[PDB]
Symmetry: D2
Subunit: 392 residues, 4 copies
Amino acid sequence: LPGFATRAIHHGYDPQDHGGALVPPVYQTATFTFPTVEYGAACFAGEQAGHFYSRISNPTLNLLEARMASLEGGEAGLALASGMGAITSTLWTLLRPGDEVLLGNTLYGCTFAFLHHGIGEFGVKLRHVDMADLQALEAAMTPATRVIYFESPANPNMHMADIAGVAKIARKHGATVVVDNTYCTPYLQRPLELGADLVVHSATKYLSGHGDITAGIVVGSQALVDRIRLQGLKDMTGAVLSPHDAALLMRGIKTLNLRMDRHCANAQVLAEFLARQPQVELIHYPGLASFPQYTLARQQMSQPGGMIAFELKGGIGAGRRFMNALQLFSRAVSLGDAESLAQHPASMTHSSYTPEERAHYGISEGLVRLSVGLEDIDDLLADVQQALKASA
Amino acid sequence: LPGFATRAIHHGYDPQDHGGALVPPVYQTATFTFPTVEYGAACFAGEQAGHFYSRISNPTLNLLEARMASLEGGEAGLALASGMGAITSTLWTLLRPGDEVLLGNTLYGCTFAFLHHGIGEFGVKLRHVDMADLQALEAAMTPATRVIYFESPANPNMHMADIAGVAKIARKHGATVVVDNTYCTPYLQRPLELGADLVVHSATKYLSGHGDITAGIVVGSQALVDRIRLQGLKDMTGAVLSPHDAALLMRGIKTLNLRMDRHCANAQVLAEFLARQPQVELIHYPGLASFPQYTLARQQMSQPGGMIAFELKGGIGAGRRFMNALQLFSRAVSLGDAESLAQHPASMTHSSYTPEERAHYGISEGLVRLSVGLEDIDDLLADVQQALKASA
Amino acid sequence: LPGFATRAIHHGYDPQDHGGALVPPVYQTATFTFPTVEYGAACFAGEQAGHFYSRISNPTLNLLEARMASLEGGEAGLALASGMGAITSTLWTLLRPGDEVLLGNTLYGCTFAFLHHGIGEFGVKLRHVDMADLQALEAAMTPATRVIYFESPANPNMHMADIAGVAKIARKHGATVVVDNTYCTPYLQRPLELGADLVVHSATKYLSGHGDITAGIVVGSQALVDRIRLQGLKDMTGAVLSPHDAALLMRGIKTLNLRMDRHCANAQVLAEFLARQPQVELIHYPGLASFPQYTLARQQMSQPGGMIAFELKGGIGAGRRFMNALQLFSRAVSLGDAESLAQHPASMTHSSYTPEERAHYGISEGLVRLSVGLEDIDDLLADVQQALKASA
Amino acid sequence: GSNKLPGFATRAIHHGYDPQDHGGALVPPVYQTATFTFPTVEYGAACFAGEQAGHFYSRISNPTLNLLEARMASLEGGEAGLALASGMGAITSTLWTLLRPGDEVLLGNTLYGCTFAFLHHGIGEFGVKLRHVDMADLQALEAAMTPATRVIYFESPANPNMHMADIAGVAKIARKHGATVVVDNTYCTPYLQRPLELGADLVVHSATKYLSGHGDITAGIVVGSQALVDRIRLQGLKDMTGAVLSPHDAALLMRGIKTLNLRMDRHCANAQVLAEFLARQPQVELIHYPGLASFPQYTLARQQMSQPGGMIAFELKGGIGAGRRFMNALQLFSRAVSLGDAESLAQHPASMTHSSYTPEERAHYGISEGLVRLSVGLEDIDDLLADVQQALKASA
């Protein structure tokens, strides 16, 4: 098997099958035609191949898919118009009313919304567990329980779950495990190899790596992905990825290894820096010894990630000011671009709410999140340094 | 009030406001930054115009939306990654278990699937009612009924709906009337102007006009679209349209009027031609006097349209013979491309079936369906001429 | 022989050939590979159809070029980065020091510049001649005369050349004739059918039709074109056309006929309105009976075009006032966009000069020039109308 | 202190752009528009007259391009930038503006094929006098200066042998006699070498290669002083070539440059291992890579380039026919001519670009019989090793 970046650059494509084009051409085209009609017949049946319409299949998309399936080690892949396109398409297909789904204690906000105000409102039962508490997960299992869905690492503190510990419990009761692997990418973590059934990415972030597209990827077994292709996508969301945008994603995937390597080194220096600063009460970075799941981290992820969460002594007012002072970093929700981003949920994403509500939904007053980019490290240090002083 | 063509080209944009750029610049960006947290706090409650994410707002996206709002004469618009993306994003937000949805008697296949196999399996009641029959409709109006949805003209026979009459009833019961106006486009039929509440399109078809993008649009009230944006799109579909594809869609719309005029002028020659032919048994062209609903159709459509359906003697065997013998028309599903397309569902989409089954879905054995392109008519004429000779 | 519109849409491509894709895929690739070194040996002599590098050959560009050949009724077509690209690539190939070029009396500014300030300065001799005057042409030929280059109709007064007469005079001395056929497009005029050897285009204008690309075309004889490819393009300008932009261009070409009809019709009307107005000294529009060379116009052009020029009685000040009152028309150079455009060279392009220098060059103090767009005629009228009022 | 220059990667990603000047957009919007409009007829008269800042036409100027230009400038350490449709675009546009008949251009000994062709079969034929000199030999260069010498042009490293030139040594000679020094800097990118900081007047790239890095666009760049870049803008490109870059492709090129440091660091690490490996293999008669001591101009290479590059050339034992066999056994390297892509590429000019020719004829255009050239891409080094190991075995 070739190495990750050989595959992130070659897998699935031989130049010869398309006139020697080194870069595969872009199929920007809604429909495909048929030479006869019996031949058309046998593509709403599936013995001939060739795809029929761009909301089901497309070679540009199919290559993005095969390529991502190889990076995750899984059998098939599906591309969609966004992360949420991947998450919603997934669950709409796998769940019906009366099914229970078991959710990690904290989720990407729009995931939480899709659950508690979306599919949750159509007779599907929700329950939150701490996926790190294998005792407590077991306890919470039922036979109605059809799905376990978490992010590891998860917002806000980078709380991790033992993926293989969780698969074991799923194997025993007969439930399907879906891991949102956005933060890590296949380059760092690979849940299917630890017994997860599906993985979902917002390809909008690290995979594209250049903040210019919105996209998502499902990877798993042919059997399940085919279901998601043919029900969740075709019929239930219509989250279709543009062939233009899929080729952009494929282009940013060629440098994934190189970018992630730099994301993780930058982050580490920045983490170690932050821990030594007076204005900081708590830091959450997977690559610190101080991280409470440090061992689990090293076991499951090959590097500690580009993301840092940390908490400012003077609370929400101290984070308002830290955030306003940033000159090189940008204020934006989102992550995994070459440009360094930061957000202070207390006074951005979650503003009106007063403090108990913030805690109740697990969000500290002074908590900042950084997506550490590909900039020069002394430059980032300096922007953060001065912004810490401004926090006072 | 500027003309329809003026507006298709200019509505919502001034070059003086963007450095003098004649064509708007394309905002191929997944995220926007904030000047302060407080500015960004405002962006999640709602009170600061501009933008948060590409999944909610983006100027390229907004332009299209506004512009599509203006053509249909609606308060506000919304763009999504496909037709299905619009249909699902709308229905999802307007229905919850124990609600009902009344529907035309025949729907676009994937709309059908979604209803029966998707949302209708989470406890939403479905009923099919012939929407040209106000008696039959007012009858089905239980008090549960929350949404009335249909296509006019509708597959296969271009069956029309009394839009004004359906709206009257719905306004009476507090129902929302939702129209898929994909086939006409606002140049030819503005359902909101007949008391529709919402319209949806596959922009994949006529609006793009060029078979190179997949995309969808919703138009209607501020209140209904704010809802569909922030729940259906935001959490239940994740169907985000590429700003590149949004630009190419805008490009398309700049010739909707010229394109539709030729679509309609070609369609009508071929339809008149067909009517004088021995191999054709019956035709469904809105523009022929003998059309069962010639008069309701002119009330609602400025022109008879670009689609033709007809039935061949020799039934199914004839079809294949016809279909396979074309060399200008292409065999494909889809419609509203510059390229003329033909399909005969008995031996294509619904081939796996058997005639006894094909009765169930109202699909005749000799029904071929022309989407008439922009090519010189004499060529389209000759092509169809020899393909009928070959149907002996 | 398939009609223009059928060719503009289909020529050079069969979906079957490329896995059914209705719209050919876009070859955004800079290099091409080889299966063996033997097949690699072939693409540096060239007795095979393939490619070696996008800067000499690429399928998307070739398709475009085939499609332009067919419409201009020529053997071979070349695609380039801009019209200037095509013009200079063409001339740099066919002229060497001591060679002479006869030119139309007036030319597009940068073409004039290229000649007088570029190539002319490398020992190429230049002579300007009126090309309706066949006696003066015959009398200006010298053995040094190698090329005859002109636009027709030509700025600023829409002055025609007698193309077929020229080509006859040219035949006598074996000289090559080159026609900037930008203004008419192969849809209105076909110089090669009137004996010219080569036509060039600024595809930036009518061919794109929508103002989003820069692009040039050469069409003519296989041997001439091959040399412009291999020398002008490859070695001397390197104005390589983006595959993306070539795709958008072919997208444009699909509605060329329809757009051209609307352009010409809007124009015809505006010219009638203009000719009869109190403020208007003079008017140059081909379609008016009073246009000097009306009879020749109609021998060459199937329609009078979308361009108008007129002179305001009150000179520079009227133009200056007339230009700023416009709300729908945009002030800008350029032409053939869907948006209507205007410019008053006297106070814009040639504003630096003083009055007697602009007469010395052929520029009236109230000459205004309109690119009649695709907007509603009544709206364009209203704009012009009020700007005419305001010019007093 | 705030008068520190941001690091190279910071600038390759941020320079010249602030999201707040454009709606918060984190990525600049693409100005995919062929022309720009004026608020009054007066404001239009300024941008043809020089007075008020603004845009008239994308073939003269465009904000997407402008940002690309200001960014490449910063990276080369030049005053101004220009973006063109191709490498050759940049070069021809340059020389067509800098040279007239009777002017003399001094050229390095070897050149890129199309550049060689431009000069010998193009501008050379329009009354411009050419002379080739070993740019590595400053005595010989001083010796060739005339008062007619107007431009000194050369690549460094040079196609195809990566022959190096003393850039500083040249600009000093050129300062003395008064000439303009244009350096083709495609093979290094500004990340490894910056001729403008060593005294050159202008640099030109084929951005089609390393700057893009993903081999899907065609593009050129000129960087130099404001006046010379302006001239080239308004004479070479505007009137003489029309080599305008599509804003879409320019947006892609900026996307490429956001990773340039990383990619180059990986091309170079990869190439250094491959070269070391190659030197030790039996069939390899000789090898030419800047990062080995056996490189003739090893010290000047180190002097001038912060890393030895991604290009390797070497000669097999067995003449042409051993190449045929080697190249046709490559399963991961592609058979192509080009460089700077993430895909690794191998050309064997003997049996490819120069296949028409007969052995003898090669030696008098300069090319060995068993000469393979390599653009080492970004693949995993261990796959690239294995590919070359097994291909050598077939070339036995």
